[PDB]
Amino acid sequence: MSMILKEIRMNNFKSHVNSRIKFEKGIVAIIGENGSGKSSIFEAVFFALFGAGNFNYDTIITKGKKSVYVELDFEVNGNNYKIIREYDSGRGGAKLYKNGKPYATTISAVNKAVNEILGVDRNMFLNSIYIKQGEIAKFLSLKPSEKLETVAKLLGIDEFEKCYQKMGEIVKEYEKRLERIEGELNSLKARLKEMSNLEKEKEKLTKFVEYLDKVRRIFGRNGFQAYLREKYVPLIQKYLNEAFSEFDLPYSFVELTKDFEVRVHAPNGVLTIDNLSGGEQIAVALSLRLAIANALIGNRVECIILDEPTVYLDENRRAKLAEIFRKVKSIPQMIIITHHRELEDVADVIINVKKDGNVSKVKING
Amino acid sequence: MSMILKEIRMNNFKSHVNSRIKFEKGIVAIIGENGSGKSSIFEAVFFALFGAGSFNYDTIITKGKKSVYVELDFEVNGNNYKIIREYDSGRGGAKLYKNGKPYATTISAVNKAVNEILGVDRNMFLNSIYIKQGEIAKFLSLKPSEKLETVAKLLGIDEFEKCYQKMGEIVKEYEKRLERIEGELNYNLEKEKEKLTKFVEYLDKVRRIFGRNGFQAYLREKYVPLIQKYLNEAFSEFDLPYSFVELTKDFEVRVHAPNGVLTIDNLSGGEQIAVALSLRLAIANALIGNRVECIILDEPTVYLDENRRAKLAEIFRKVKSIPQMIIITHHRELEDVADVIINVKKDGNVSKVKING
Ligand SMILES: Nc1ncnc2c1ncn2[C@@H]1O[C@H](COP(=O)(O)OP(=O)(O)O)[C@@H](O)[C@H]1O
Ligand SMILES: Nc1ncnc2c1ncn2[C@@H]1O[C@H](COP(=O)(O)OP(=O)(O)O)[C@@H](O)[C@H]1O
Ligand SMILES: [Mg+2]
Ligand SMILES: [Mg+2]
């Protein structure tokens, strides 16, 4: 389930000693000089949604201060939630309202409530709503085989591989111990009791080893991983094709393979993103990233946040992406953070951020 | 396998726009005012070894800049590696040399090469070479609960607990589908139904046989003998007045003194610190299999009262088994305890590194 952001109030959150930003649907541009406090705005949003995870409040509390307060009004499934998360000199606290009425009141409940509502862990969610600095540029830069890799990372594949490997550890540990035992099996009372128990341990470990190995395969490449691929690929390919129509790409059919290779079927070829022209390469890259976000949540994303989406792009490409932005319609609320003033011409609502001597200020114009 | 650090060159890495530090064996003290750029030096070392973990390049690139470059020369098993990891405006890259000759050239290969070389994941390694500010202090004050706990936190019980959740969340998913299946079966690929019900089975077998104390156990039968052995070898080097030190299968220290077994919260204050460093150092040896080559203590003195800072200083004098012990701090005194001394001074947002005495 995807949310639509509505409003946030913050107290002593890094450079935002006292800010109150209201978001609207359509295309919102958050324009402000580098370091003016743009990104903090969202860290606070995510702080409001999941709170501390054990991290250090020294990182979000305004330097000098010893208390921070974030209040976020968002919307999931039409229902309007207000979540407040505060911290005052050691004493934490959090509460969650639903359509005006109290719903959760303890840090523990609120966290549980929030995850019950969104339907995904903090990471899955974060990747379905937040696109990091110049990601679309870094992507076109990766070698083809690295473009597959980051799709898998975004889907949480590597997550399971990482576990496949930890299980591997345990397996081997139990195997070397089965060697350390087999050897030991090859005063007189205890020597015999120990011998029996060494046999006993042998029966115990050779049993767990088999288990682990099976559950190790499930974390592996053709276990749950393959399953996840088999589940997302189709969804991504469906949204990839919607995007191609939306951003008006001259191809009637885009395919995503299990390995996550984007294949664009054209007249005389079955090309890859790298075969596309810079203009189209940008379009496809956004399409893919927007698709993944859809796949991570199930349906279509409500709100998508693009942090400095035009960062490592030349002057000509920045312009193309700007035009591609103008095409977006299928995403109720797209938030664009940037220092490029031009992008304002692509927004329905603009929010200006300007640091005033280590104190972020927010004004609405355009 | 443990490494010995030799040298690192960095470009636009946080406060180090252009620094080049050369490390030497024995005891190296990295002294510099708070915030002068000491710790970044090592973040860069670790950046050179594993690259952007899972990460935001905005965090390591000098503010204003849009490119960072780290070049680390280290040594594992006598072999001398030079690993270079760079990032220029979106375009990443990495290469690894071995004894002068190219060995790995792609980010993907280098990472794979590095892990093939060290023999442990980024975390296991990191804990076998980097003692985080406070760790020591945490062992002299934390309750007997925290201790025996915070110990396993080091052996990696956390990473194992995430896979514990994964497992439960994979059974949940397998059940969501096993559902759709039954649905479709009422209102050939019933074989998928078999594969899934079978996995949900294996998953629950391990899920229970490893519950909250599943890894707890596994850990005890892998690091404990070693933590002890190494914990002992430390007691000797430090000249502790005990012939033997036991490690309860619960990661608790049992010092053996003439008047029977003695506990940590009952030993000499000066030995408290001494024992604490021995335990931590031991845990580092266990994590890697053999004796650590290089051990980095980041501000190992913070949280200690005047007197204790002095004791630890003197216990650092005794450390001869570790070929390279790197001390980071903003306590000038400690330079007395160093063979080499690297000074770090921030010159208006730009770290500078000098060599002295
Ligand atoms: N803990 C803090 N207390 C007060 N100000 C902070 C804190 N942490 C960071 N800042 C300020 O916030 C700025 C960085 O904010 P950020 O939102 O990342 O900017 P932007 O996204 O506009 O590039 C820095 O300019 C810094 O001075
Ligand atoms: N990305 C960055 N670009 C430039 N300077 C940075 C960056 N990140 C941190 N710093 C600066 O470096 C200092 C922190 O460096 P650090 O090496 O952690 O210090 P120390 O270890 O001496 O306490 C802070 O003083 C901070 O202002
Ligand atoms: Mg930003
Ligand atoms: Mg430091």
Curated annotation (Swiss-Prot), chain A:
Q: How does it assemble?
A: Homodimer. Forms a heterotetramer composed of two Mre11 subunits and two Rad50 subunits.
Domain remarks in the Swiss-Prot or TrEMBL record:
The two conserved Cys that bind zinc constitute the zinc-hook, which separates the large intramolecular coiled coil regions. The 2 Cys residues coordinate one molecule of zinc with the help of the 2 Cys residues of the zinc-hook of another Rad50 molecule, thereby forming a V-shaped homodimer.
Pfam families attached to this UniProt entry: AAA_23, Rad50_zn_hook
Q: What does this protein do?
A: Part of the Rad50/Mre11 complex, which is involved in the early steps of DNA double-strand break (DSB) repair. The complex may facilitate opening of the processed DNA ends to aid in the recruitment of HerA and NurA. Rad50 controls the balance between DNA end bridging and DNA resection via ATP-dependent structural rearrangements of the Rad50/Mre11 complex.
The name this protein goes by in its record: DNA double-strand break repair Rad50 ATPase
Q: Where does ATP bind?
A: 14, 35-40, 61-63, 133
Similarity-based family: Belongs to the SMC family. RAD50 subfamily.
